[PDB]
Symmetry: C6
Subunit: 201 residues, 6 copies
């Protein structure tokens, strides 16, 4: 029977949030982490072993693979999720510490103080997710072709290379895209609601 303080912190951290938004956002986060950890990781098990190019020059395949894939999508998604998860942890730690400070102050002596930080965290999450989506659109796009052309030294003129299981990777990319879009929509809806309620004072 030592769950009262945890419940108190949980209910105090959810003051200004919508009744429905909490469950949707939590289950979306859980779905994202489960999908990232369970099966999509094995799809990128063989990123370079099965990658072959049609040439005889040794060492050309390494540089061609480097140029084709500047960074694997799995680690990009990991960075995205950790960067969208950090601000909530910061907010939780800050509110926990200030609550303990207030508890000590009231034990010894037996708007905007919190909403501003909440809005800052929400806008940071939104801007980070939209920036990551824009970067992914700019670098890789949202389609993969099984044939790639490589024109980097020391490979002569042009060479051809083939990827592995492009359809599966494309499907998973689309899934991550739609999940991120849903997350952005939920965050912007929450921000609109809180701002609309704050206008009415």
């Amino acid at each position: 029977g030592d769950w009262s303080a945890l419940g108190k912190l949980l209910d105090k951290v959810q003051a200004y949030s919508t009744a429905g938004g909490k469950v949707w956002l939590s289950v979306l986060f859980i779905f994202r982490i489960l999908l990232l950890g369970t099966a999509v990781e094995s799809a990128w098990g063989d990123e370079q072993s099965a990658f072959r190019c049609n040439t005889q020059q040794p060492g050309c395949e390494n540089v061609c693979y480097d140029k084709s894939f500047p960074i694997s999508h799995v680690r990009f998604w990991v960075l995205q999720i950790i960067f969208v998860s950090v601000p909530t942890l910061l907010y939780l730690a800050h509110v926990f510490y200030v609550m303990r400070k207030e508890e000590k102050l009231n034990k010894k002596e037996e708007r905007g103080g919190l909403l501003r930080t909440y809005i800052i965290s929400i806008l940071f999450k939104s801007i980070f997710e939209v920036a990551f989506l824009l970067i992914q659109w700019y670098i890789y796009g949202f389609s993969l072709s099984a044939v790639y052309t490589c024109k980097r030294d020391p490979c002569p003129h042009q060479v051809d290379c083939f990827l592995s299981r492009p359809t599966e990777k494309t499907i998973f990319i689309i899934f991550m895209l739609v999940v991120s879009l849903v997350s952005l929509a939920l965050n912007i809806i929450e921000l609109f609601y809180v701002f609309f309620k704050g206008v009415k004072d």
Copy 2:
């Protein structure tokens, strides 16, 4: 001695369900997850290493494997199970939050409100499972042959490829099919019972 609240939530979430259906559905879910995680995963350990085609052109085997298997069945099953498991988690979280809200309201002051969401969750589970079954029937069918014909560029005209342990994969596919059929039958029986009882008011 901190299990009273968990038991209260567990008994409150099982209000309108049948006496017998709960145990059957729970053990079916446990059997499905155990079978998916324990042994069937190792059967797909070598999906592309042992896959060989009878040709000398480099790079043809990659595209032939891509065309033969647009998506591995294991990850399809993982997506199916997570999509049929999410709505129950949503329902549980929603009922937990509303119960906490009612507890706070009654502490400070010392049909269809829930059945509609229950029916929505049941119908969502049924439609998702039947849609996944229909998609699996449409794409892969329910039989695998050890010999496949590939007619994709840059392979000349037609080439032949061989899979690995098709009989074992076919057996596991049939097992998953019958498990899904049992799940659908249980869900439709529960829906029929609850609707029949609701007709009598």
Copy 3:
């Protein structure tokens, strides 16, 4: 100090069982699962990598391996153990739920009802284990030879193939066989005892 209810359920679920049979069956189950998970799994680490056939035709080894081994014994044993473990879990869940229902009924108001299901579970376990043993006898037998003859297309006429470490696999097969025989004997002894006691009323 929250183990009283678990102990109550444990002692209530063991009403009609013999004093000695409980420990023997439990330790047999633990021994079986430990042996299956600890060391025998590594013996089947290389099932197809070390399997070689004496031919030059590409792709013949895959179909020959498929025909030689329709299904690996490890996954067959996993299916057998899960199918002999499910009915006990069903019985436990059912008795737990009915006990909670009776507790609620008696709180608000401050033979064959269970033996039939017990006998059904025992007979189901016995019939499933004997069926699995019969299937294993019919398909694989209980001996493995290091040399196998393959006569399947597209391999010409007949080819020869060699397995790996047949003696170790044979020893483990014999071990699993004797364990299953002991389990069947214990189950039939329990059934005989309970029926003999029920005859005397």
Copy 4:
């Protein structure tokens, strides 16, 4: 504060044992399991990949490896340790159940009964460990040579094969041998003490 019953069972199960023998036997068991699980397992990581024979006939190396090593020592040690650990678990379960039965009997009503089983367990442990040691002496001996001669079909006349890191395996075999000898000595000392005390009545 729910450790009183566990302590009661622990002190009741250690009635007739020596004051010093308990700690020595327990730490010996812990040392054995830690050594088996931590580092010696990796030494047998490459049992067949690095095993090479000096021939050109395909498939001869498989049968030669099978004949050279009928069973890996690691799994033999696992079987030995599980077979010497089971009887103590049986004794603990039996004494726990009879203690619960006596507790229920005394709640409702508010030598050789145990020593015989104890001696049976001790003698079973001793006979099993000595039998395993004798079998290991009879089959593998206690020395490994880096060169082995194979005279099994279909290899012509005689062929030569080489093992991997024989010195390390020999050292670990000697370590397991001395640990087993210490265990046997401790068990026989305990049996001698208990019999000598029982003679005096």
Copy 5:
């Protein structure tokens, strides 16, 4: 309900630290360990398997790889993080032991004593992190080129070698660099604050 002593130790160990610095430093440490353990480790999965040099002499690639990479960056980062984490653990253990000693002393009898050690720990952390950064700058720099020249025996004159995915490794190196810079800035800010407050007495 056994968390009071842990909370007491946690609040006593955070006496002289800033209100804001605690959460920032803790979340920075958590982010660092999560990034090190989650995804960056897999990027160095193939450090030597994919490393190829353009030559025919056997054994030259080993020495060229040894000369190119005196030590992998992952283990260097592990050493850095463990060396910057040890002093805080030492401080925590020391304060815990002295608090227990004082508790015993006061039970039986029913500035600079701690700040000096705190400052020592802070300066040790700062000097260790700056030393590690300087060493990394001196040895590897902060850029990797896909082509390397090797001039070590027994390779004739000069040979060329190619690395793998240099861009990803460079990105992760930059990430670790900026994280370390942030950590150093936070530590120096904390030291400046505590010294400035100690000047005023």
Copy 6:
């Protein structure tokens, strides 16, 4: 709230030890185990796969590798740490059992007894660590060269072999050496202190 007995045992087992030595020794042990388990294990991931010798005779590389490395350093370090950790566990178990015996004796009835064993454990730890260090100095030394000469049958006259990443292994060997030296110094300081205090009576 069930930590009082554990704290009592912890404070009673630390009677004669120095105030400062406890934390230093504990953190040294934690650092050693963390370093052994975290990163140094992966450095020996490829001990035999990358080891190549300049010859054409099959099977010579196996015996040359066996002669070059009689035993891997990682398992030697594991044996060293387990052998220096066992005596403390023995002392803890013995003091726990005698404390329980005294508690039972005083409940029913409502120098050198411990220091000798403490000194025995300390001297055993010191002698074991110094013996392991001497053995490591005698067998492997403290330096590794990338080129090794092999003169064992059936290799003709002399052959040359190359190791992998010798610099990293040398650095880790030096690290383990200095850690062991620090441990020996701490143990001898503790022994000197306790003997000096015991002289004064």
